[PDB]
Design a binder for these strands. Structure first.
Length: 341
DNA sequence: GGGGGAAGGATTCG
DNA sequence: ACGAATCCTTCCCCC
């Protein structure tokens, strides 16, 4: 089987560059301004010109400006990025029926029934890159390997504007020398748990007792790592369907006053409904991020679809249940809809 | 003991 | 180190 992974480099910032090409070569920083005070918020994405100096996703905007005071800071325009992304995904469908749209800037293509050997794959890759650069002016990195995981790892190693193949031989080596923390799907939390279990490389997962490994990171993640270690991971490329939709908004000031929170809650509901479009949810959850950044949620599932009027009234009951089951002030408030009919 | 689901905290990622 | 969506464990009903 042969998988080709496509990752759009520093996507949000690149799109801003395509929409205002005079930004090329300058440090571009796309941010989420939370509006709690001047420059409150964080960097969502930055191009290479800014990343090389340490300005990257997650760094507070204020901190970023101390490092690059003259870089260009832009607000996130998510809908534009999504429309651009969709056009690019369509260009990719021309290369394979079985395509998995992993995120706004990632997609996997199963080009087995389309190419033989890793020479034709590399060529199909260049073909895809040039195509995208031509039609949308966007640069992408391509990763090629036997499964989705190593296809992703190859791209991570070739970014930006790169292409890389990880053959069956490099795979076996990586299973020995790659930091377990560099394996997709393994975040910060899991990484630390594995180390304390004595696992720093994939190969090490085979030296531990499965019911011990499973006890720490869970059955699903355990089998995931074991499969990868034995060079047996072969999940099929298939695009999943959105299981839920929601919106969470940061309030100007923290508080626990119902009448002060409702406006934000309603704003979030209105936006979530617009996004739902023609989907009718049967489940609603209200989510509150407290002052100490801890998240509390309460939801309800109905035997039928939820109208917007039902959403408004139900969301207040859930928020009240939340304010009741926790004395902490709230900082962000929002909702999520799911179980679409 | 275990199947069918609802519920909410846990975890991943930009 | 400051938004979105799914994952994972627990609990409840009931055969």
């Amino acid at each position: 089987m042969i998988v080709l992974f496509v990752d759009f480099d520093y996507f949000y910032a690149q799109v801003e560059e395509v929409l205002n090409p005079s930004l090329k070569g300058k440090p571009v920083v796309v941010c989420v301004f939370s509006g709690r005070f001047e420059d409150s918020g964080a960097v969502a994405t930055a191009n290479y010109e800014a990343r090389k100096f340490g300005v990257k996703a997650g760094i507070p905007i204020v901190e970023a400006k101390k490092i690059l005071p003259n870089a260009v800071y832009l607000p996130m325009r998510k809908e534009v990025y999504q429309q651009v992304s969709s056009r690019i995904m369509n260009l990719l469908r021309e290369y394979s029926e079985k395509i998995e749209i992993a995120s706004i800037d990632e997609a996997y293509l199963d080009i087995s029934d389309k190419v033989r050997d890793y020479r034709e794959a590399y060529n199909l890759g260049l073909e895809i890159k040039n195509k995208i650069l031509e039609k949308e002016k966007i640069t992408v990195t391509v990763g090629i390997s036997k499964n989705k995981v190593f296809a992703k790892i190859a791209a991570d190693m070739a970014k930006p504007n790169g292409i890389k193949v990880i053959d069956d031989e490099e795979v076996k080596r990586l299973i020995r020398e790659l930091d377990i923390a560099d394996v997709p799907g393994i975040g910060n939390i899991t990484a630390e748990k594995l180390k304390k279990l004595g696992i720093n490389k994939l190969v090490d997962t085979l030296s531990i007792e499965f019911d011990k490994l499973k006890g720490m990171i869970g059955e699903a993640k355990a089998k995931y790592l074991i499969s990868l270690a034995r060079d047996e991971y072969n999940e099929p490329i298939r695009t999943r369907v959105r299981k839920s939709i929601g919106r969470i908004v940061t309030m100007k000031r923290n508080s626990r006053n119902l009448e002060e929170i409702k406006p934000y809650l309603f704003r979030a509901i209105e936006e979530s409904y617009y996004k739902l479009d023609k989907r009718i949810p049967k489940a609603i959850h209200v989510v509150a991020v407290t002052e100490d950044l801890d998240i509390v949620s309460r939801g309800r599932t109905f035997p039928h679809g939820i109208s917007k009027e039902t959403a408004y009234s139900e969301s207040v009951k859930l928020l009240q249940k939340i304010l009741e089951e926790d004395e902490r002030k709230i900082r962000r408030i929002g909702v999520r809809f799911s179980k679409f009919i």
